[PDB]
């Protein structure tokens, strides 16, 4: 039964918009990662409320518009993080 978690992600979607911050903002204050998070706030979150869940998408729009910017960070991380092979898919300028 998955009737009283529904409402763990309705704090999470009703967050997002109250302080307009991203994922990873509203993932350390519950104390998960954001692959735990999106995966409710995409799922549950839009499941039992479909308007909700356009409150987290629309932040998400902006993210990726900035994103750009953020991937300087990005950048280094590759070094912390596991091996880096020439494969990266299909993209365009």
């Known amino acids: 039964m998955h009737d009283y978690i529904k409402e763990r992600t309705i704090k999470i979607g009703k967050y997002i918009?109250?302080?307009?911050?991203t994922v990873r903002v509203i993932a350390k204050e519950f104390g998960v990662s954001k692959s735990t998070v999106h995966k409710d706030l995409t799922e549950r979150l839009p499941e039992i409320n479909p308007d909700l869940a356009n409150e987290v998408k629309?932040?998400?729009d902006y993210h990726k518009s900035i994103?750009?910017?953020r991937g300087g960070e990005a950048t280094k991380l590759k070094y912390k993080k596991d091996e880096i092979l020439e494969g990266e898919p299909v993209q365009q300028s």
């Open 17 to 21: 918009v109250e302080t307009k911050k």
């Open 67 to 69: 994103r750009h910017l």
């Open 58 to 60: 629309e932040i998400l």
